Design an enzyme around this catalytic site. Sequence first.
Site, PDB file in Angstrom:
ATOM      1  CB  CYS A  99      -0.915   0.001   1.063  1.00  0.00           C
ATOM      2  SG  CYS A  99      -0.121  -0.132   2.806  1.00  0.00           S
ATOM      3  CB  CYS A 144       1.087  -0.210   5.666  1.00  0.00           C
ATOM      4  SG  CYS A 144       0.726  -1.361   6.971  1.00  0.00           S
TER       5      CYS A 144
END
Length: 134
Positions: free
Chosen positions: A59, A62
């Site tokens: 991502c 995070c």
Amino acid sequence: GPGSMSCYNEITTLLEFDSNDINTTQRINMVNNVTDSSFKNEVLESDLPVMVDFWAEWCGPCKMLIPIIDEISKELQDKVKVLKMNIDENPKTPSEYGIRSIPTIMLFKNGEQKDTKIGLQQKNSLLDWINKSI
């Protein structure tokens, strides 16, 4: 011409660690990752609302949401159970619940779906959102 000969060599491979697996009936009343079986077993058996974040390390932010959840989890612990599910650990999960994108925040209550929200949310956002769903 020259006989291109090359005999390949080999080295014995050894193991590092042993094999071990254990499991007991301990309460999942803590921010952690759950496995697909335990997910349904525990979450769908929780009368109190459970917020499940379906995540992955690819991502980016995070690193932020971990501290965010770290602090917020204990705030919510009484009311809403903060739980995590990595789409790497549970490849069936994002197919079942149609998780196209991450973090991602999904609200459960008595095992039933309340609301869903995708993207990065801050402490106040998380609290505000889940309190609207519960």
